[PDB]
Amino acid sequence: EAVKKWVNKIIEENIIAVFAKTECPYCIKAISILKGYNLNSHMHVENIEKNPDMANIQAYLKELTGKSSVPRIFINKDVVGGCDDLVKENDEGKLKERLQKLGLVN
């Protein structure tokens, strides 16, 4: 229960929620893309490797999204997925439309 509540709070309190780990190039790329849309004020990045319950967090992220790998990316509680998913949404215009609907970009 405790791990799930903790993960939920991160996703609920932050419009943009990224679960990451230490020295993870696709985490860094995803976060940089997101920071490039000036989202920092509504972004939270959680390093789940520096955590005693990493495996439990990963298992719950898999229950929520289908994958246990990081990065895992949520926007307004909606599952974006990983960095590749973000790149697809970014290149095809879905990401900006997401952010426009949230008032995060003009």
CA-to-CA distance for 21 and 9, rounded, in angstroms?
18
- Which residue minimizes CB distance to Cl ion? 81
CB of 95 to Cl ion, least distance (A): 15
Q: Closer to Cl ion by CB, 6 or 26: give it.
A: 26
Among 16, 71, 81, 86, binds Cl ion (CB under 5 A): 81
- CA distance between the termini of the chain: 39
By CB under 5 A, tell whether 58 contacts Cl ion.
no
Asked if residue 65 binds Cl ion (CB under 5 A), the reply is yes
User: What angle (nearest 5°) sits at the alpha carbon of residue 81, between those of residues 102 and 53?
Assistant: 110
Cα separation, 4 vs 18, in Å, equals: 15
Annotated binding-site residue? 89: no
- Output the known binding site for Fe(3+): 44, 46
